[PDB]
């Protein structure tokens, strides 16, 4: 992470040990579940890429998942290099402009990453960009491991609409798909894969029922 | 959040990462349960709107619930604007008076939010007002998801009064209803939806029995 | 809470957010169980009444229990007022002597509460006194909710003495009763409500057996 | 605990509230289990006797166990007094030499305890000595409450050697006995109280098999 | 651990108590499981060998495992001594060069360990080297205690590929074996020890199927 000192200067305040342990506990227990994506974002707020690489290193034991994340980072960096090409030869006496691998923290030191993070002329947020690249790698793992496709998800005959909705949405989240497919699924596949007892009522509600009105009406129905 | 420095000046001390992770853990596990409302209030004490927006952003994945909360904030702000209209043209060289969206932190920076929070002439508590608007959005979600209406709640024949009371009140909390309906329900629906074995005794207690005397008398009855 | 600065001066360092969340978690999960009493004492060490009122406010949703605690505080304060009556008219230029509601923090500010807490002439520990008043309110709730009276508690025929002792004592704790009734119960009701197989041995031990010798002798008996 | 200031001086930094809550949670849940002994040691590192007495006070509700611990402290102090008798009349203008109850923190203030802890001429570690006395009291409670003697511990016919070893050692730990009895038990009672299917193999291993070779060989056997 | 002061000087900031408690909780609950290896690495980041010895001391009660770790440290140190032999007689007025046991922290003080950790001429990372030696001792314990060999691991007939893969990999991790044996096992033993229903499909996928394509294809198959 980064701390400030009198005069407008900046320094490094390393990610703490019990914050890294928590990241490890969220990954080991939830096994790269959907919640692994947000837990990471928060435990990484105010931190720099070097420390994001330490967090991943502590969980490096997982290798199928860390292979997927590593692949993504290399790609995004290449695109950064393509759309932000070397401006030209570098005038000396200054810090080079950030390249794709520096955002990652593999070829670059934390101080250079902090100088960009707090560069008066044009500060580059090296820290937030890398977290996002890593979050696409974590999200793909969730979809890879997701145990149930949404089409299979259904309601126990005596099971209620709320728990079924909870399970149906859990999967829709991990199955990123697209937001429009989600709208069709949330307004139809929920009613279609439901049992008939609460469907009659989900149909009575009307057309384009909202979830607030689908849950209120089916409370106790079955 | 906000920190003070020598001379009476103020600065920003960002909400910490493991406090945001906890907010995420309370939402992911309890699934916008009733306890999500208080956990938030406490994890947000001493914090400013910008940081309240970060907490919500980490849990932004939940979208049906964050749609309900977002709707409420826009409304309250409009009412703030209606009852606290623009005083007139703004004399220059000073900070504008707070508008509805500034309390939210969408159109306004933290420093302006802190200057109001600690404005010597008329300090506006931008931070506490927004938390309350958000808490009405969270509370509506609890009632939307509540799995059981109180009328259905009853006592297992061999189940005791204490657990039944615990389940009956859990729902009464989430079903905000009104405090008077609560008094009628707490003094009648509890006895009526109970089994007859402990009801005989709940009737022996007398009229307007208090809970302290309804629980003491039915300890072991059944 | 209270912090000290160069010169012998004192200031306020508010109870932290994740300490308040823990108090909320202990109350929501244990449901005003016996452990709620000590958790509170510890999370309130070094804190002042204002902050004790914030902790209770976060859990204010619980109302039957907060009605019992509120009743007790008003009483103790009245007794404080009765045995520590207004000394007389107050010489001006100084802080008034503490009244019953100031100990609570309802009519008084934290600074006045801290000035008494650290008054050189006669410092009044406003903070510890209020916590105790609140702990009597919390303890009454535990006894109100206690699910099992000790007389009913018995040993499963195949159940051991240790678990039965654990359950028997759990209730004796919550059923404050008096320490002497406890001695009679701990030396008799334990043996009497036990099964006969381990009682024969609890009788062989001798008269006035101690728990250390009642548990050692019945390890494996049944 | 103890903090240092410019000039070589020392002060008191009280044990924090959420560290005391954890000690309470480890005692309430594990019920003076074996792990209560180490949890305490760690939560007490850098702390002084006064703060060790606060930790015990928060859990003072438990009284059979706190009676056993209290008895031990009085004894050890008496032995300290016997082998470290009053040197003679005390020259004035200095701090007295530590007595048995001062190590406990009952008759002595924290500052005196810190002056000894950091006495240039002959610093007495009042803090660590008392923790050890308390740990003998906690360890006796574990053995008092231990639910199963090792001789009874055996292997389910379909149960594996690893879980049986885990249960057999759990008890051997709490049953301090002596290290030699432990060696005889760990090399024999484990094989003798095992089922015959894995014993044949535990015998094939050879004589004086080590645990590393008893567990590797019986992995899958049964 | 180590802190820095004005002038470029360094000091010691001891490992905190609740960080040591967590290490104890991870060892007591997971019982020297695979996750014990990473939890340790993180809770030890920024710490020095003396503090790594305190963490191990708190869990010293476990003795079969601490015998395995202790054996390894002695060996690695001997190899350090062999490949980094005494340079010769030591010029006086300086700190000796680090020996094998100093890296451990048994014969050496923290200040000397910190002077090497931050030696301008040739800083020796005494802290990280010892953690690695300890991690080989912890990893051997995991393999010793591992309850299931991978060959036995199979898929319940109605069990899915994902959970079976999770269990199969859990063991492959703890059974360090070699990375090549892992590739053969991950591409064959998974399919071979699977049930026939999902194997038909795992065979349809093609030759050298990747896990991402073995999990996607068998989602719902069985
Ligand atoms: O606020 P956090 O980001 O969670 O950091 C906490 C916080 O210390 P700070 O207030 O200085 O940030 C804790 O205090 P509380 O917020 O709970 O009041 C403190 O715990 P203690 O008060 O018990 O000391 C703990 O410090 P530590 O882990 O050394 O005990 C430290 O956690 P981090 O060191 O990981 O930042
Ligand atoms: O013991 P740690 O490894 O340091 O983990 C702690 C532990 O959380 P859990 O009870 O969920 O395991 C703390 O509880 P205690 O050890 O103090 O009893 C809790 O701190 P609080 O009780 O004050 O809430 C905090 O959990 P959280 O941050 O979610 O509130 C969490 O710290 P980490 O999340 O950083 O691991």
Distance B19 CA to ligand 2 centre (A): 10
Dmax (CA) for chain D in angstroms is 75
- E178 vs E173: CA distance, rounded Å: 10
Q: D22 — contact with chain E (CB < 8 Å)?
A: yes
Handedness of CA B66, B71, B74, B79 (dihedral sign): negative
Strand ranges (DSSP E) for chain C? 2-5, 9-12
Residue nearest to atom 14 of ligand 2 (CA): D22
Give the 3-state secondary structure percentages of chain E, helix then strand then coil, rounded to 5.
60, 5, 40
Cα–Cα dist E192/E32, whole Å: 30
Chain D residues near residue C214 by CB distance under 8 angstroms: none
Contact list, E150 vs chain D (CB under 8 Å): none
Of residues C131, C127, C100, the one with CA closest to residue C116 = C127
How far is the CA of D109 from the CAs of A94, C8, D113, E158, in angstroms?
59, 20, 6, 67
What tokens does B145 get? 């998801």
A18 CB neighbours in chain E (<8 A) are 18-19, 22, 42-43
Q: How far is the CA of C22 from the centre of ligand 1 (A)?
A: 14
CA distance B13 to B1: 5
What is the rounded (10 degree) CA torsion for B55, B61, B62, B64? 120
- How far apart are alpha carbons C95 and C111 in whole angstroms? 10
D18 in contact with ligand 1, CB cutoff 6 A: yes
Residues on chain A touching B21 (C-beta within 8 angstroms): 22, 39, 42-43
Instruction: Go through chain B and tell me how many residues it has.
Output: 222
Is residue A69 within 8 A of residue A141, CB to CB? The reply is yes
Cβ-defined contacts of C11-16 (< 8 Å, 24+): C12/C48, C12/C110, C12/C111, C12/C114, C14/B45, C14/B46, C14/C51, C15/C43, C15/C47, C15/C51, C15/C54, C15/C55
Chains C and A touch (3+ CB pairs under 8 A): no
Containing B4, the helix (H) or strand (E) segment is: strand B2-5
Packing angle of the helix pair E17-30, D17-30 (nearest 10 deg):
20
Residues D191, D189: Cα–Cα separation, whole Å: 6
Residue A171 host element (H or E): helix A161-174
Shortest-distance Cα residue to atom 1 of ligand 1:
B16
- Token pair belonging to A24: 């490890």
* DSSP secondary structure string for all residues of chain D: -EEEETTTEEEE-PPPHHHHHHHHHHHHHHTS-TTHHHHHHHHTTT--HHHHHHHHHHTTT--HHHHHHHHHHHHHHHHHHHHS---SSPPSSSPPPP-HHHHHTSSS-HHHHHHHHT-SSS---HHHHHHHHHHHHHHHHHHHH----TTT----SSS-HHHHHHHHHHHHHHS---HHHHHHIIIIIHHHTS-HHHHHHHHHT-SS--HHHHHHHTTT--
CB-based contact, A54 to chain E, within 8 Å: yes
Angle at Cα D211 formed by Cα D208 and Cα D215, nearest 5°?
120
**Is some CB atom of chain E closer than 8 A to the CB atom of D140?**
no
Of B22, B37, B212, the CB nearest to C21: B22
Residue whose CA is closest, atom 6 of ligand 2?
A: E22
Distance CA(B151)–CA(E168), nearest Å, equals 49
Buried residues in A167-201 as b, exposed as e (16+ CB within 10 A):
bbbbbbbbbeeeeeebeebbeebbbebbbeebbeb
Q: To the nearest 5 percent, what fractions of chain B are helix, strand and coil?
A: 60, 5, 40
- SS3 state at A3: strand
Q: How far apart are CA E45 and CA A57, in angstroms?
A: 12
Count of C-beta atoms within a 10 Å radius of residue D15: 22
CB distance E201 to E217 below 8 Å = yes
Q: State the Cα–Cα distance between residues C141 and C69, nearest whole angstrom.
A: 8
CA distance D76 to D82: 10
Closest to C18 (Cα-Cα) out of E23, B103, D27, D19: D19
Q: What are phi and psi of A2, to 5 degrees?
A: -135, 135
Q: Residues 65 to 84 of C: which have CB under 8 A from any B CB?
A: 68
Give D101's contacts (C-beta < 8 A, 6+ positions apart): D77, D107, D108
What dihedral do alpha carbons A67, A72, A73, A78 form, nearest 10°? 130
The angstrom resolution of this structure is: 3.0
Interface test with A, best of B17, B53, B147, B149 (most A CBs within 10 A): B17
* Spatial CA neighbour of E158 closest among E215, E221, E212: E221
The answer to whether residue C31 neighbours chain B at the CB level (below 8 Å) is yes
Q: How far is E7 from chain D (nearest CA, A)?
A: 15
Contacts of C197 (CB under 8 A, 6+ apart): C157, C221, C222
Among chain B residues, the shortest Cα distance to C22 is held by B39
Largest CA distance in chain B: 75
Q: At what angle do helices A36-43 and B17-30 cross, to 10 degrees?
A: 160
For residue A215, the cross-strand partners are none
Question: Cβ(D27)–Cβ(D59) under 8 Å?
Answer: yes
Question: Which residues of chain C make contact with B35, given a CB cutoff of 8 A?
Answer: 24, 28
- Residue E87, min C-alpha distance to chain D (Å): 37
> Any CB–CB contact under 8 A between C173 and chain D?
yes
Task: Please indicate whether, in this complex, the C-beta atoms of C42 and D28 are within 8 angstroms of each other.
Answer: no
Beta strand spans in chain E (E) = 2-5, 9-12
Q: Give pairs for B66-75: CB < 8 Å, separation 24+.
A: B68/A212, B68/B137, B68/B140, B68/B141, B68/B144, B69/B134, B69/B137, B69/B138, B69/B141, B70/B137, B71/B137, B72/B133, B72/B134, B72/B136, B72/B137, B72/B140, B73/B104, B73/B130, B73/B133, B73/B134, B73/B137
Going by C-alpha positions, the residue among E208, E195, E188, E51 that lies closest to residue E130 is E51
CA D68 to chain C, closest CA, distance in angstroms equals: 9
Within a 10 A sphere around the Cβ of A213, how many other Cβ atoms? 14
Spatial contact of E99 and E81, defined as CB atoms under 8 Å apart = yes
Distance, in Å, from the CA atom of B174 to the CA atom of A222, rounded to the nearest integer, reads: 21
CB contact under 8 A, D21 and C22: yes
The CA R_g of chain C, rounded to the nearest whole Å, is 23
Distance (Å) of CA B15 to CA A127, B1, B66, B132, B205: 18, 6, 20, 18, 52
Least Cα separation, residue C192 to chain D (angstroms):
20
The encoded tokens of residue E18 equal 């609740």
**What value does the CA radius of gyration of chain A take, rounded to a whole number of Å?**
23
- CA neighbor of A162 nearest in space, from B152, B31, B150: B31
Phi, psi of C97 (to 5 degrees): -75, 150
Q: Do E162 and A145 touch (CB under 8 A)?
A: yes
**Could you tell me if B57 and B23 are in contact, meaning their C-beta atoms sit under 8 angstroms apart?**
no
Report the alpha-carbon distance of residue D48 to residue D115 in Å, rounded. Answer: 11
CA D199 to chain centre: 34
DSSP string, D26-62: HHHHHTS-TTHHHHHHHHTTT--HHHHHHHHHHTTT-
Rg (CA), chain B: 23
Distance, CA of B71 to CA of C111 (rounded, Å): 40
Q: For residues A130 and A105, is the Cβ–Cβ distance under 8 A?
A: yes
Q: C13: CA distance to ligand 2 center in Å?
A: 22
CB pairs < 8 Å spanning A and E: 57
- Where are the alpha helices (H) located in A49-121, listed in sequence order? 49-58, 64-83, 100-104, 110-117
Task: Give the distance between the most distant pair of CA atoms in chain E.
Answer: 75
**What angle is formed at CA B112 by the lines to CA B106 and CA B118, rounded to 5 degrees?**
125
| Ligand 2 center from residue C134 Cα (angstroms) | 26
Q: Which residues line ligand 2 (CB under 6 A)?
A: A 18, 21-22; B 18, 22, 25; C 18, 21-22; D 18, 21-22, 25; E 18, 22
- Best CA proximity match to E166, nearest among E176, E155, E178: E155
């Amino acid at each position: 992470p980064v701390q400030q000192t009198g005069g407008g200067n900046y320094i490094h305040v390393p990610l703490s040990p019990r914050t890294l342990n928590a990241w490890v506990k969220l990954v080991e227990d939830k096994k790269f579940g959907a919640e692994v994506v947000p837990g990471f974002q928060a435990l990484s707020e105010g931190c720099t890429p070097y420390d994001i690489n330490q967090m991943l290193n502590c969980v490096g034991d997982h290798q199928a998942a860390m292979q997927i994340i590593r692949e993504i980072i290399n790609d995004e960096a290449a695109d950064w290099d393509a759309q932000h090409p070397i401006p030209g030869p570098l005038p000396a006496g200054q810090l080079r402009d950030p390249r794709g691998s520096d955002i990652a923290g593999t070829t670059s030191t934390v101080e250079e990453q902090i100088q960009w993070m707090y560069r008066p002329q044009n500060p580059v947020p090296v820290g937030n960009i890398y977290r996002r690249w890593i979050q696409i790698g974590l999200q793909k793992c969730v979809r890879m491991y997701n145990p149930t496709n949404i089409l299979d998800v259904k309601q126990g005959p005596k099971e209620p609409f709320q728990s079924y909705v909870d399970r149906f949405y859990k999967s829709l989240r991990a199955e990123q798909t697209d937001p429009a497919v989600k709208n069709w699924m949330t307004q139809t596949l929920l009613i279609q894969n439901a049992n008939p007892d609460c469907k009659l009522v989900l149909k009575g509600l009307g057309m384009n029922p909202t979830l607030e009105e689908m849950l209120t009406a089916c409370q106790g129905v079955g």
